[PDB]
Design a protein around this ligand. Structure first.
Ligand SMILES: C[C@H](CCC(=O)NCCS(=O)(=O)O)[C@H]1CC[C@H]2[C@@H]3[C@H](O)C[C@@H]4C[C@H](O)CC[C@]4(C)[C@H]3C[C@H](O)[C@]12C
Length: 184
């Protein structure tokens, strides 16, 4: 109990069944996703049909981070989030070329989203709604750190209890825990 997850006292309404919070500015999130590939390994183990979604957070990267949350909404709106995840992480943390909102847009353009399509999405209702969802879900759990993962809007993963002597075992322990939780 509490070893691999905790139960929220107030469940999150409208949350993706498997919800990962992250920041492109967060080095740990980069380790979590681009080295451990947690979400990929979780997805492989999830029951068929279960939605896993990543939500961006606003509390890193200054006001640019908030723009990135909106760009991430654009990505989800356009269905390119999986693709742009890598160049956004790399642009922020590796090449350090994401220093303004136009640099974010450039990543999308280079990923094949025309500037005009990005801008129209940026200003669209679907994007505003996705931004509202990301911000509301973070508020609903009083999120103070990333990465974090929540299942069924009810269960918060606790990686602290998990054995880290072997990264492969850690990843599968974590993925197994998510699957178990998703089936509750
Ligand atoms: C920064 C993360 C915790 C952030 C946080 O406080 N989130 C909210 C609370 S909770 O978590 O959701 O409960 C921690 C949790 C698990 C950690 C990871 C795991 O320990 C597995 C490896 C261990 C390696 O030594 C470093 C990379 C890493 C991939 C760790 C990076 C970072 O320290 C993580 C990602």
């Amino acid at each position: 109990d509490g070893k691999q997850y905790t139960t929220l006292e107030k469940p999150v309404a409208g949350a993706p069944q498997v919800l990962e919070f992250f920041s492109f500015f967060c080095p740990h999130c980069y380790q979590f996703e681009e080295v451990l590939h947690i979400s990929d390994n979780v997805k492989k183990k999830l029951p068929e049909g279960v939605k896993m979604t990543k939500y961006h957070v606003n509390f890193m990267g200054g006001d640019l981070g908030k723009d990135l949350t909106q760009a991430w909404a654009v990505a989800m709106a356009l269905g390119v989030e999986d693709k742009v995840t890598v160049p956004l992480f790399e642009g922020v943390q590796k090449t350090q070329t994401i220093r303004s909102a136009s640099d974010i847009r450039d990543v999308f353009i280079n990923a094949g989203i025309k500037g005009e399509e990005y801008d129209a999405a940026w200003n669209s209702f679907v994007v505003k709604s996705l931004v509202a969802q990301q911000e509301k879900a973070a508020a609903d759990v009083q999120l103070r750190g990333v990465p974090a993962m929540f299942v069924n809007g009810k269960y918060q993963l606790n990686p602290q209890g998990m054995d880290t002597s072997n990264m492969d075992v850690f990843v599968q322990q974590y993925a197994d825990t998510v699957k178990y939780l998703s089936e509750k």
